[PDB]
Amino acid sequence: MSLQMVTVGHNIALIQPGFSLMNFDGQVFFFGQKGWPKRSCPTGVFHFDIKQNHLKLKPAIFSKDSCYLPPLRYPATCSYKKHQYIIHGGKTPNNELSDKIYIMSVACKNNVTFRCTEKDLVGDVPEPRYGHSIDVVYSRGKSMGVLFGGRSYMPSTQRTTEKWNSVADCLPHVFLIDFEFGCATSYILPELQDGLSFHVSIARNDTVYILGGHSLASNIRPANLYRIRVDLPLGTPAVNCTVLPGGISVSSAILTQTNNDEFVIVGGYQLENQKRMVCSLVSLIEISEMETPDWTSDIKHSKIWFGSNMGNGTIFLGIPGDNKEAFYFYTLRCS
DNA sequence: GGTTTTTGTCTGGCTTCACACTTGATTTGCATCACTGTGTAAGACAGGCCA
């Protein structure tokens, strides 16, 4: 795992904490710019090209049948196999939380244009949230989305302008979501007692593993690991969760896929005052510590760090500038 | 209804200021001076995407 500094072009200001990267056919794209989209790029979606350790953001266009979704911070995203991306939730430039679901696909590639379609949701729609997970599980030749966790504003009855921005963890209900028709079913599980946000999520076959996270009520970053199995018979699905020992304690960690069936997670925040400098390896479930990479002193002495998974087993991370550039960016590679 | 208060009424002879008038040398009131540094926005100017 080698660390590499990156320089950025004129629109470095667009990058902010909560951004996302999506990988389409080896090409990387960036979503969730700071501010509302400007005339220079009306969609807010960018080709994310790092050539010779230099990052260029190039405007991407949407198809005629697309939504123009707002930039979103901390939405739950996953990849769905045409190959497409699922966006649910997030914060808007106006600080509203979106409950909507957007679906991204490559509509046309000339020398890329995207199709962005919103899927309406009925039934037990999850309250709009950020900092939550969504993945796709496969059971008996059927595909279903699993959504869990996060935080949101207070409900309209208790919300008050003096604490207008105050947040609480969402109730820890598992949500099954059929993307074709847009339906949602909520499952209360006895093993999931507390709320959780900014956790890590790993989906394999009919299972989703939940790692780390932060629970607001206790203000604990629990060192538990949860396995979630989903069976899809012809009738109503069945979901069963089990607690597993050996769970790491980390919030806002980043996750990437090395080779096949091996995942590595690079640090997040282990305590409010402390940062998780170590890295973990998950084999599909067993967790082993890895040799910590050659962090520079700037990374070591920063209080805040943020990043995203690029797709190619490589992480794109960023650190805040000195008091006297706004951000300094690095790329950490694996495999 | 009785039983309690507020607020007047009628005089004058009192006490305590304000005004009266002047002159001209002080004292106050008031608007102005000359002057730059700093914020602001009107307007040069650098710039990179796509044809």
Could you give the topology of this structure?
Blueprint: E1 3-8, E2 20-24, E3 27-31, E4 45-51, E5 54-59, E6 61-62, E7 76-80, E8 84-88, E9 101-108, E10 113-119, E11 122-123, E12 133-139, E13 142-148, E14 151-153, E15 167-169, E16 174-178, E17 183-187, E18 200-204, E19 207-211, E20 225-231, E21 238-244, E22 254-258, E23 262-266, E24 279-283, E25 286-290, H1 297-301, E26 306-309, E27 314-320, E28 327-333
Parallel strand pairs: 1-5, 6-10, 11-17
Antiparallel strand pairs: 1-28, 2-3, 3-4, 4-5, 7-8, 8-9, 9-10, 12-13, 13-16, 14-15, 16-17, 18-19, 19-20, 20-21, 22-23, 23-24, 24-25, 26-27, 27-28
The protein binds one DNA strand of 51 nucleotides through residues 9-10, 40, 58-59.
PDB class: recombination/dna
Keywords: VDJ recombination, RSS, RAG1/2, recombination, RECOMBINATION-DNA complex
Entry title: Pre-Reaction Complex, RAG1(E962Q)/2-intact/nicked 12/23RSS complex in Mn2+
Description:
The protein is mostly beta strands and 335 residues long. It has one domain. The protein is built from 1 helix and 28 strands. It has one helix at 297-301; strands at residues 3-8, 20-24, 27-31, 45-51, 54-59, 61-62, 76-80, 84-88, 101-108, 113-119, 122-123, 133-139, 142-148, 151-153, 167-169, 174-178, 183-187, 200-204, 207-211, 225-231, 238-244, 254-258, 262-266, 279-283, 286-290, 306-309, 314-320, 327-333. The strands form 6 sheets. The protein has an 8-stranded mixed β-sheet, with no helix packed on it. A 5-stranded mixed β-sheet has the order 6-10-9-8-7, with no helix packed on it. Strands 11-17-16-13-12 form a 5-stranded mixed β-sheet, with no helix packed on it. Strand 9 (101-108) and strand 10 form a beta hairpin. The longest helix is centred in the last third of the chain and has 5 residues, at 297-301. It is globular. The N and C termini lie close together (7 Å). The protein binds one DNA strand of 51 nucleotides through loops.
